[PDB]
Design a protein around this ligand. Structure first.
Ligand code: CLA
Ligand code: CLA
Ligand code: CLA
Ligand code: CLA
Ligand code: CLA
Ligand code: CLA
Ligand code: CLA
Ligand code: CLA
Ligand code: CLA
Ligand SMILES: CCCCCCCCCCCCCCCC(=O)OC[C@H](COP(=O)(O)OC[C@@H](O)CO)OC(=O)CCCCCCCCCCCCCCC
Lengths: 77, 139, 146, 80, 143, 40, 40, 740
């Protein structure tokens, strides 16, 4: 009765980018210090985000995506 | 008689007990040059206000400890505090300083008390004073 | 020390087994094992989960003496100021409690004085010492011979 | 209350008065020492018997001696 | 919303206001107790206190005492309660004799020699009554 | 608690007084005496 | 260095060095000649 | 970068080595009395009192911590070397159920060669109870050369730690701002130390420990098992042992984690072959906690504005009842080392207590549960360590309160409110201590008197008035049903203490259900009473260190002073140090009762031998239930009965234990010289002896003095605790080595 997991497929991808996008939406409206320290080239493509904020929101999106994918694989779809 | 705004304190369980209203209590008053934080002898920190202050404590030792803290732990040294004994009837007895000059420095007009004209080794033997209500130092 | 020597030697004499004391009293482990451990077998069994025999009172007094001897230790080790402050707290608790403020003491409760504390510790100590040894000796001799 | 006595070996260093926490001691003029001052115990009914004055005395033996005696509420230093 | 403050606006007393000591409900409930009520004579105060303190004392010695598995069980509980009430009355009388010596301030009728005597007598009577009524309730097939 | 010695009923009544009555009476008298303010 | 020599000469170092010297003497003697209850 | 250092602040010279007492101004002048010696050894490592600059104190603390790390590394390297050269580990590995572990060999000089008992396999040496052999077997050790290399690496690491201390103090000393980067320190120490350490250990286990232990448990001889690097070099063997290893690292990056289910399980329980935990369960465990700790990192704002701030969180959690709330605590814990020491000591001591109480119920090491001596030794050792650390927290907190507490920065904050209702706290705690002691120890004394009077039906026992721990039984029932019901993917219970089958290895019970009855109720509430009393003593020390109604200026007197005087009726033992001194004894009492309960219950209801039929015969039979309810039962069925193996140890290999047993009973008594007496008597005696030595003109220049009051109390408590703990250690080791 080992928990069921999903092999890689475009659906798992779409879940990954969806989670990353909603994590970006969350981070834009929550982070107190959006741009501090190392910046990134060609700003305003990242909503005025520095390197640290970008990495933080990407990592949070990956964590959300991993949790969501594993939970959904435990149930159907 | 005794005037001064009490320091702003939140209240603690270390304060007075029934002895204050039954036997006596003690009062300490001083002039503060600025509203600043000092330490209650009974536990906790309270702010004292600019101008006159008045505090009720249960023991003379607590009042003198507060006076020592006032004299030592503040750059604008507070040397003007006064300690009184307050009786339940209403009598107020001035205790410290006695004549207005601190006992550490010698001031004229004081009277010697408890001073013996001999040295500690010259006290009488107990056997020579026994069966009388006296002690070798009492003689 | 005196009574231990007398009692062990006379136990050997009365049982006829003088050799046990003779060859076991030269080292302290023989004192610990052949005298104390061996002769407590019947005393501590005065009352058991199974029943009670005539040595039950002596076992109770043995434990009682051990207890009083232990109790003297805290008048002998812990000293006044700790208990004085503790009594201050208890006095606050009594004075601040409703329905207990109607009852007040006549003499202000204070901790025992230093000399009185030493005397009380020595008293509990001596009582425990005497009761413990008396119980052990009586129980051991009564079980062996009496 | 306790008794406090000052003997003629005092050198008038005033350490005992400074060390007293209940303001029992005082400095009075004198002539037996170079400092021309000797300790005194006028307010002896407030003494608790902490022996801080004795600890502060630097003479070969204490020029100030405290003899504990009758115990009052003040002597016990009780707050209740 | 500070709910804990100084005791009756006096910071320098050894107490401070809490929702347990200076609550309106607390004061209302503690002031209506028999020992703290208004207009009660001391003997009536003693009756009211002793009735409860003797009624509740029947509990132990009934399901726990040496006679707890026989027909002499409620009897033993009653006897123990009565003896405890008697010792309590003796202690109360001794305290009243010792505490109030000479000067009898009439500020409080309970804090008075004769007031405490009435309180002790009423406590004895109330303890007797409460213990006996509890015994009557707890018994079966009474003569 | 039951004995075969002569007048075995005596401990039935003597021990309680030595156990309760005498200690309680002595406690009360001493407590009153040591607490009686004044007159010495 | 002078400081090292002074440190080596302090009381604990001397006491422990002498104790190990004595202990080594006793242990070696007891190894090469054990069980000496008396001068036989 | 937030790094800031100072170059060559203190030159490296040997001159100050020749002048002891250089740190103290009062001691560097030169000794006149013997007290100067005792002060020198006492104020050495108190850097806060030596200097007023906080940066210098922090630098000294950093290098001293480097030194303690070097010492611990030397200890570990010594352990590995003595297990590699003077041990039968290679012999024990082939026959673990018939060979006793041993890693200490005794030279035959004066007859101590009798200590070299027969530990099986033809080896003669002292049996060890630390459990190092089981840890090494779990780590994948199979040859003594690997242990020798580990010892060499440990020595190298110790030398590196020493050089690190010398460099980071005498050459490049960090700045104060560097030390106060609590956010950066916490991030690096949660993610870089705990998380990375757990990840590295999980990698080691998966790639080394599991294959070796799987081959070992099957029955393969240690010499046949491939060396650990061969599994990495040739992954064919790894794929053979675990099929999913053929899939490589692809499923990890595609979140197809389930394929790794064969070597990352959630079995729970014990391995039947060895009696330890499953290494796959431990692998997924340490991997999961590694992930959790790395995620717990990246939490505090350090350099890129992306993170929380500790001060904001502290000052934001305030409520109606608490005035200013957690305000000013950040400045307290970033400017005073003593408060940090107190918090860390308390948490660490509780952590080792948790370690002791959890390592016995779920034994993680192979063949450890069946080695009763190792179980008891580990439990008691880490129990004592935890107790000592908790008392140290209680001490250094009072030190902080006396020294580093400043009323100006604490107005209506939680610390001040604590200092305001301290009388209420102490009074209610004193009442609860009295109530607990009365009712519990009165149950004990009541049972004693009922048994002595011949009325066993009036006792507090399972046959008599029950007093059953219904809540503990309910939680045991819940944890027994957890696999499948509330933890569906778990296969067995967390431990068999709650319930289940009896796991037994080599005809010896490894773990069976631990039933709680009336005796367990009484002992657990006795534990509660003792713990609350020790907490009361230490809390009174901490709260009342500044002042009290008796002495209103104790803060000015210091933290370590004997008394205020014979006045006020007597003011003995009022300092916070005296409260620590008093709490040490109560910690000893509580921990002694705890270890006694553990030992007796383990011997009477779990440990024992299982027959081929399945019947379990316990070490002391089922006597705990009907004897541990009276003090006489504790005295007769536990101390007298189980001390036979330590009093009859003379003439055999266990004789040393017997000797040490008596040794303890001596030192304890010796301590009563110092606790029961005072220093004036000894001073007068020294006066007479000084006259004697003066008559012969042999008087010493350093005038001898009797020990100070504080020193006398410290010596008494030290020798007392040493004697008692040594007695208990000898008794426990002899009993546990003599019960098979
Ligand atoms: C919509 C998306 C989605 C869905 C459907 C699921 C679905 C599931 N997740 Mg899941 N998860 C998600 C998103 C999702 N998750 C995200 C975004 C994350 C990242 C935050 C996680 C992280 C996560 C973890 C870490 C775990 C799951 C687990 C599970 C499964 C069991 C949960 C359950 O009811 O048992 C649990 C039900 C209980 C009643 C148990 C709760 C009792 C716990 C022990 C209390 C512990 C208290 C705690 C330690 C103290 C607080 C700490 C402090 C910080 C406050 C379930 C299939 C679990 C799993 O895989 O099971 C095999 C599991 O361990 N999820
Ligand atoms: C494939 C790469 C890609 C593309 C095409 C876009 C495109 C866009 N992003 Mg974007 N973004 C990217 C990667 C990308 N982003 C990454 C990697 C991050 C991580 C930091 C973000 C974070 C980000 C934020 C936080 C915001 C945008 C916003 C926007 C929109 C307006 C800003 C702009 O430059 O136009 C635009 C549709 C903004 C938007 O949607 O307008 C409200 C906005 O607020 N982006
Ligand atoms: C060791 C502690 C102890 C013990 C063994 C008992 C035992 C008892 N109490 Mg009790 N009690 C105690 C402490 C204790 N009490 C305390 C501390 C209080 C508060 C002051 C009370 C207040 C109390 C009341 C108010 C009553 C009892 C009653 C009873 C009896 C029936 C149980 C019950 O709840 O009645 C349940 C109710 C009934 C059986 C109906 C009776 C009508 C039983 C003999 C009852 C009793 O004896 O009634 C006559 C009763 O009414 N108790
Ligand atoms: C705290 C410890 C403790 C406890 C709980 C008990 C309990 C008991 N003993 Mg025992 N005993 C003890 C210690 C204790 N003993 C000790 C130390 C000795 C001396 C060595 C004895 C000697 C002894 C004898 C000689 C006998 C007992 C007997 C008994 C039983 C009935 C008599 C009794 O005590 O209750 C009766 C009731 C009281 C004594 C008064 C209790 C006070 C009340 C319950 C306090 C309640 C406070 C309340 C909850 C607060 C509420 C606040 C708010 C709600 C208002 C009972 C099971 C008798 C028996 O036969 O046992 C079966 C008996 O003959 N005991
Ligand atoms: C000091 C000597 C002494 C002692 C220790 C005892 C001891 C005892 N007697 Mg006893 N007795 C004594 C002398 C003594 N007797 C004498 C001289 C008589 C003849 C009058 C009796 C007649 C007597 C009777 C008739 C009974 C006892 C009983 C008992 C037992 C119950 C406890 C008790 O004494 O109260 C009860 C006994 C008394 C109150 C007797 C009066 C005490 C004597 C007469 C005076 C002693 C005063 C003493 C010196 C005061 C010392 C002060 C000091 C403590 C500071 C107990 C074993 C009872 C018993 O056998 O129970 C099993 C019992 O029924 N005794
Ligand atoms: C916690 C660390 C630790 C501990 C407790 C032990 C304990 C032990 N080791 Mg051991 N060892 C360790 C680490 C440790 N080792 C390490 C790291 C290594 C690798 C280098 C070794 C290598 C080792 C070997 C090779 C041997 C031992 C042996 C022994 C046993 C005999 C004791 C001994 O050597 O004294 C022997 C006596 C002395 C050393 C006394 C000599 C004088 C001393 C050094 C006085 C010190 C001052 C001195 C005068 C120098 C002045 C210095 C000054 C400037 C400060 C003993 C059980 C022996 C053994 O078990 O044989 C069966 C053995 O042969 N050990
Ligand atoms: C990932 C980074 C990292 C790591 C691993 C550590 C680890 C440690 N720090 Mg630390 N620290 C860090 C960053 C880090 N720190 C930063 C950034 C700061 C500044 C804000 C500090 C400031 C700091 C202070 C002020 C103190 C420490 C202390 C300690 C030690 C505490 C004792 C302990 O845990 O015992 C466990 C011990 C070990 C596990 C032994 C580790 C031995 C070395 C030093 C570890 C080297 C690991 C390294 C990554 C190389 C390994 C990789 C590869 C070879 C496998 C511990 C070794 C305390 C101390 O003095 O210790 C020296 C101390 O007081 N830290
Ligand atoms: C510090 C942690 C750590 C380290 C250094 C390694 C190191 C290694 N692992 Mg590994 N691994 C780890 C943790 C670790 N593992 C954990 C926690 C898991 C479980 C998720 C795995 C699961 C795993 C698998 C399934 C495989 C490796 C493999 C490998 C090897 C090649 C991978 C590589 O270096 O390419 C970058 C290498 C020796 C591969 C190999 O060839 O080893 C047999 C392989 O197939 N590992
Ligand atoms: C992380 C652990 C830790 C650290 C870093 C410190 C750090 C410090 N402590 Mg602290 N302490 C701790 C744990 C710790 N403590 C614990 C667990 C306790 C409870 C026992 C205490 C109790 C304590 C007290 C009571 C005092 C300190 C003091 C101090 C300060 C230095 C003075 C000192 O003790 O050195 C000098 C150290 C010694 C003289 C110890 C030598 C004597 C030991 C006890 C002998 C040990 C014998 C050994 C166990 C067995 C040998 C057997 C023999 C036959 C060979 C310093 C801030 C003192 C202070 O006020 O500083 C401000 C102080 O008075 N500590
Ligand atoms: C689980 C069953 C077995 C254990 C049962 C024992 C429970 C006994 C008491 C109930 C706990 C109630 C906590 C609520 C209390 C609570 O949550 O307070 C919280 C409250 C603070 O409220 P605020 O929201 O103002 O707090 C803001 C805070 O975040 C501070 O910044 O503090 C106070 O009111 C003062 C505390 C008085 C505390 C009284 C002392 C109680 C001591 C005894 C507790 C013993 C528990 C021992 C076992 C753990």
């Amino acid at each position: 009765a080992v928990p069921a997991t999903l092999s890689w497929s475009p659906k798992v991808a779409g879940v990954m980018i969806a989670c990353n996008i909603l994590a970006i939406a969350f981070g834009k409206l929550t982070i107190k210090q959006q741009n501090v320290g190392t910046p990134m080239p060609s700003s305003n493509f990242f909503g005025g985000f520095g390197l640290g904020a970008v990495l933080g929101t990407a990592s949070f999106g990956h964590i959300l995506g991993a949790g969501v994918i594993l939970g959904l694989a435990n149930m159907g779809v | 008689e005794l005037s001064g705004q009490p320091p702003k304190f939140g209240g603690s369980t270390g304060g007075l007990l029934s002895k204050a209203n039954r036997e006596e209590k003690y009062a300490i008053t001083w002039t503060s040059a600025s509203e600043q934080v000092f330490e209650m002898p009974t536990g906790g920190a309270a702010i004292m206000n600019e101008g006159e202050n008045l505090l009720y404590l249960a023991r003379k030792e607590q009042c003198l400890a507060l006076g020592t803290q006032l004299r030592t732990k503040f750059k604008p040294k507070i040397q003007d505090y006064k300690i009184y004994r307050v009786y339940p009837s209403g009598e107020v007895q001035y205790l410290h300083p006695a004549d207005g000059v601190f006992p550490e420095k010698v001031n004229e007009g004081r009277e010697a008390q408890g001073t013996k004209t001999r040295r500690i080794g010259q006290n009488p033997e107990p056997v020579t004073i026994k069966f009388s209500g006296k002690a070798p130092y009492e003689v | 020390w005196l009574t231990f020597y007398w009692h062990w030697k006379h136990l050997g004499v009365w049982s006829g087994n003088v050799a046990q004391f003779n060859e076991n009293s030269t080292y302290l482990m023989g004192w610990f094992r052949d005298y104390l451990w061996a002769n407590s077998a019947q005393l501590i069994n005065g009352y058991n989960p199974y029943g009670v025999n005539n040595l039950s009172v002596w076992a109770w007094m043995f434990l009682f003496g051990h207890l009083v001897w232990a109790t003297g230790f805290m008048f002998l080790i812990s000293w006044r100021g700790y208990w004085q402050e503790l009594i201050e707290t208890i006095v606050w608790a009594h004075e601040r409690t409703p329905l207990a403020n109607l009852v007040r003491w006549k003499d202000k409760p204070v901790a025992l004085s230093i000399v009185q504390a030493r005397l009380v510790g020595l008293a509990h100590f001596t009582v425990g010492y005497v009761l413990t040894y008396a119980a052990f000796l009586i129980a051991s001799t009564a079980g062996k011979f009496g | 209350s306790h008794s406090v006595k000052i003997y003629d070996t005092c050198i008038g260093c005033t350490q005992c008065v400074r060390a007293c926490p209940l303001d029992v001691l005082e400095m009075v003029p004198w002539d037996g020492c170079k400092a021309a001052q000797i300790a005194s115990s006028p307010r002896t009914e407030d003494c608790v018997g902490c022996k801080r004055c004795e600890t502060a005395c630097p003479t070969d033996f204490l020029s100030i001696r405290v003899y504990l005696g009758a115990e009052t509420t003040r002597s016990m230093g009780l707050a209740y | 919303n500070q709910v804990v403050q100084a005791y009756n606006g006096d910071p320098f007393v050894g107490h401070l206001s809490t929702p347990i000591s200076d609550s309106a409900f607390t004061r209302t409930f503690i002031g209506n107790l028999p020992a703290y009520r208004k207009g009660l004579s001391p003997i009536l105060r003693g009756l009211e206190v002793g009735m409860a303190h003797g009624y509740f004392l029947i509990g132990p010695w009934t399901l726990l005492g040496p006679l707890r598995d026989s027909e002499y069980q409620y009897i033993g509980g009653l006897i123990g309660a009565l003896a405890l009430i008697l010792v309590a009355t003796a202690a109360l009388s001794s305290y009243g004799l010792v505490t109030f010596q000479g000067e009898q301030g009439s500020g409080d009728t309970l804090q008075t020699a004769d007031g405490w005597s009435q309180f002790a007598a009423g406590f004895f009577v109330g303890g007797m009554g409460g213990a006996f009524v509890a015994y009557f309730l707890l018994e079966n097939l009474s003569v | 608690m039951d004995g075969s010695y002569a007048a075995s009923y005596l401990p039935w009544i003597l021990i309680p007084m030595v156990g309760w009555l005498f200690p309680a009476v002595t406690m009360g008298l001493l407590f009153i005496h040591i607490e009686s303010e004044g007159e010495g | 260095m002078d400081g090292l020599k002074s440190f080596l000469s302090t009381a604990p170092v001397m006491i422990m060095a002498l104790l190990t010297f004595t202990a080594g003497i006793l242990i070696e003697f007891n190894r090469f000649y054990p069980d000496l209850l008396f001068h036989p | 970068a937030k790094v800031s250092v100072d170059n060559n602040p203190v030159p490296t010279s040997f001159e100050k080595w020749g002048k002891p007492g250089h740190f103290d101004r009062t001691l560097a002048r030169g000794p006149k009395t013997t007290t100067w010696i005792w002060n020198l050894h006492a104020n050495a490592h108190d850097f806060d009192s030596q200097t007023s600059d906080l940066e210098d104190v922090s630098r000294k603390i950093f290098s001293a911590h480097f030194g303690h790390l070097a010492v611990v590394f030397v200890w570990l390297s010594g352990m590995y070397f003595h297990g590699a050269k003077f041990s039968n580990y290679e012999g024990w590995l082939a026959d673990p159920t018939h060979i006793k572990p041993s890693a200490q060999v005794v030279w035959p000089i004066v007859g101590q060669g009798i200590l070299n008992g027969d530990v099986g396999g033809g080896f003669h040496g002292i049996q060890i109870t630390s459990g190092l052999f089981y840890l090494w077997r779990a780590s994948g050790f199979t040859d003594s050369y690997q242990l020798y290399c580990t010892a060499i690496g440990g020595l190298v690491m110790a030398a590196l730690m020493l050089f690190a201390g010398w460099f980071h103090y005498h050459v490049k000393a960090p700045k104060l701002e560097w030390f106060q980067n609590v956010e950066s320190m916490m991030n690096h120490h949660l993610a870089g130390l705990l998380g990375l350490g757990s990840l590295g250990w999980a990698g080691h286990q998966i790639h080394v420990s599991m294959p070796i232990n799987k081959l070992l448990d099957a029955g393969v001889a240690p010499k046949d098992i491939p060396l650990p690097h061969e599994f990495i070099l040739e992954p064919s063997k790894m794929a053979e042992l675990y099929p999913s290893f053929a899939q490589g690292l692809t499923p990890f990056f595609t979140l197809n984690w389930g394929v790794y289910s064969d070597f990352l399980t959630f079995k729970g329980g014990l391995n039947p072959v060895t009696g330890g935990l499953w290494l796959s369960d431990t692998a997924h465990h340490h991997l999961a906690i590694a992930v959790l700790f790395i995620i717990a990192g990246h939490m505090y704002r350090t350099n890129w504005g992306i993170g929380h701030s500790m001060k904001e969180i502290l000052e934001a959690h305030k409520g109606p009842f608490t005035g200013e709330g957690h305000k000013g605590l950040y400045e307290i814990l970033t400017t005073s080392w003593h408060a940090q020491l107190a918090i860390n000591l308390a948490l660490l001591g509780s952590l080792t207590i948790i370690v002791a109480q959890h390592m016995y119920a779920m034994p993680p090491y192979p063949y450890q549960a069946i080695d009763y001596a190792t179980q008891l030794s580990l439990f008691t050792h880490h129990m004592w360590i935890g107790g000592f650390l908790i008392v140290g927290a209680g001490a250094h907190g009072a030190i902080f309160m006396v020294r580093d507490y400043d009323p100006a920065k604490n107005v209506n904050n939680l610390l001040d409110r604590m200092l305001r209702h301290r009388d209420a706290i102490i009074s209610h705690l004193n009442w609860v201590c009295i109530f607990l002691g009365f009712h519990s120890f009165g149950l004990y004394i009541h049972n004693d008197t009922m048994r002595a009077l011949g009325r066993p039906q009036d006792m507090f026992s399972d046959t008599a008035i029950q007093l059953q721990p219904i809540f503990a039984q309910w939680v045991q029932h819940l944890h027994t049903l957890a696999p499948g019901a509330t933890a569906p993917n778990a296969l067995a219970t967390a431990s068999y203490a709650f319930g289940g089958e009896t796991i037994a290895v080599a005809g010896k019970v490894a773990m069976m259900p631990i039933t709680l009855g009336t005796a367990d109720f009484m002992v657990h509430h006795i534990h509660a009473f003792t713990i609350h009393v020790t907490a009361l003593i230490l809390l009174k020390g901490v709260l009342y260190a500044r002042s009290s109604r008796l002495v209103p200026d104790k803060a000015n007197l210091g933290f370590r002073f004997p008394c205020d005087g014979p006045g006020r009726g007597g003011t003995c033992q009022v300092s916070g140090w005296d409260h620590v001194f008093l709490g040490l004894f109560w910690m000893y009492n509580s921990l002694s009762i705890v270890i006694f309960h553990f030992s007796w219950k383990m011997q009477s209801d779990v440990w024992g031998t299982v027959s081929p039929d399945g019947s379990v015969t316990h070490v002391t039979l089922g006597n705990f239930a009907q004897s541990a309810i009276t003090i006489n039962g504790w005295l007769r069925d536990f101390l007298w009965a189980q001390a036979a193996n330590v009093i009859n140890s003379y003439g055999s290999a266990l004789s040393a234990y017997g000797i040490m047993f008596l040794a303890g009973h001596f030192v304890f008594a010796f301590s009563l010289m110092f606790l029961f007496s005072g220093r004036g008597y000894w001073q007068e005696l020294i006066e007479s002896i000084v006259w004697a030595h003066n008559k012969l003109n042999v008087a010493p220049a350093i005038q001898p003095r009797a020990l100070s009051i504080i020193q006398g109390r410290a010596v008494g408590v030290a020798h007392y605790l040493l004697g008692g703990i040594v007695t208990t250690w000898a008794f426990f080791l002899a009993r546990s080595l003599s019960i098979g």
